[PDB]
Amino acid sequence: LIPPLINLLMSIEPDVIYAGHDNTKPDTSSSLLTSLNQLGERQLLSVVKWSKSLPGFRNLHIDDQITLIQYSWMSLMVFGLGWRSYKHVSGQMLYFAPDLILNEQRMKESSFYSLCLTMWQIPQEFVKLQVSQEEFLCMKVLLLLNTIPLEGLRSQTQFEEMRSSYIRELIKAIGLRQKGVVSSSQRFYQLTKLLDNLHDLVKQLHLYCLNTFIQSRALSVEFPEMMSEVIAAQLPKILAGMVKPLLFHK
Ligand SMILES: Cc1noc(C)c1S(=O)(=O)N[C@H](C)c1ccc(-c2cc(F)cnc2Cl)cc1
């Protein structure tokens, strides 16, 4: 049967979020980018609500919670995109929302084809490894807890206990399907290395994000309130590597 913390993680998963995109008019760079940022804002709000329901998280210092959301939102948003894309369109379109779906031809015709390809790796990776919903749920929690400040957190001990608990739960998620010691330990190496590898992909999204933010008036791409806050709060510091990426393997 499904381990209860994994069953809890499924009950608190954010519900479907609509981008609000007018599909009756042709695509332009600004309309698409604006819709994606608006979707971004709504998804960020749902990450915050999710984190308040996420066992352990509310028990960290309030400054730590904020910092970890500010550090990880981009990883969580693209991991989420990867999963929706995998689950609804077999990983072969980018499923940002039910009303905002980009097949490859729509990607090609956008003003950000390369960004689309970069983001598209993630669902292609889920397809390859046949990632379970239970694995996915646990790995997503680990992304929230995957970077800390160079000086550490105010609630460092509590944080380590929480992170260690979800690592243990990921191992149980793996145990549901992969029977055998050698297959399960190799599976744990694969999934955790995928998380290590995300840091690089995310860094490219962070740079693109910062460049777009700087240039937002020229591009006609608005950045809503909470998104503007998390970018201004931490993004240069993150790009600079003035944080501590947690790694599973050297
Ligand atoms: C890239 C990127 N990621 O987040 C933000 C914000 C950016 S950005 O380049 O500053 N803005 C553009 C419009 C943008 C591009 C992609 C996404 C985005 C990315 C993602 F992986 C899952 N969902 C969404 Cl809505 C959200 C916004």
UniProtKB/Swiss-Prot annotation:
UniProt similarity note? Belongs to the nuclear hormone receptor family. NR3 subfamily.
Q: What is known of its domains?
A: Composed of three domains: a modulating N-terminal domain, a DNA-binding domain and a C-terminal ligand-binding domain.
Describe its function. The steroid hormones and their receptors are involved in the regulation of eukaryotic gene expression and affect cellular proliferation and differentiation in target tissues. Depending on the isoform, progesterone receptor functions as a transcriptional activator or repressor.
Q: Which gene encodes it?
A: PGR
Q: How does it assemble?
A: Interacts with SMARD1 and UNC45A. Interacts with CUEDC2; the interaction promotes ubiquitination, decreases sumoylation, and represses transcriptional activity. Interacts with PIAS3; the interaction promotes sumoylation of PR in a hormone-dependent manner, inhibits DNA-binding, and alters nuclear export. Interacts with PRMT2. Isoform A interacts with NCOR2. Isoform B (but not isoform A) interacts with NCOA2 and NCOA1. Isoform B (but not isoform A) interacts with KLF9. Interacts with GTF2B.
Designated name of the protein? Progesterone receptor
Post-translationally, this protein is described as follows, namely: Phosphorylated on multiple serine sites. Several of these sites are hormone-dependent. Sumoylation is hormone-dependent and represses transcriptional activity. Sumoylation on all three sites is enhanced by PIAS3. Desumoylated by SENP1.
Tissues expressed in: In reproductive tissues the expression of isoform A and isoform B varies as a consequence of developmental and hormonal status. Isoform A and isoform B are expressed in comparable levels in uterine glandular epithelium during the proliferative phase of the menstrual cycle. Expression of isoform B but not of isoform A persists in the glands during mid-secretory phase. In the stroma, isoform A is the predominant form throughout the cycle. Heterogeneous isoform expression between the glands of the endometrium basalis and functionalis is implying region-specific responses to hormonal stimuli.
**Whole-protein coverage range:** 683 to 932 of 933
Subcellular compartments: Nucleus; Cytoplasm
Cysteines engaged in disulfide bonds, as pairs = none
Please give the residue ranges the record annotates as the region AF2.
5-250
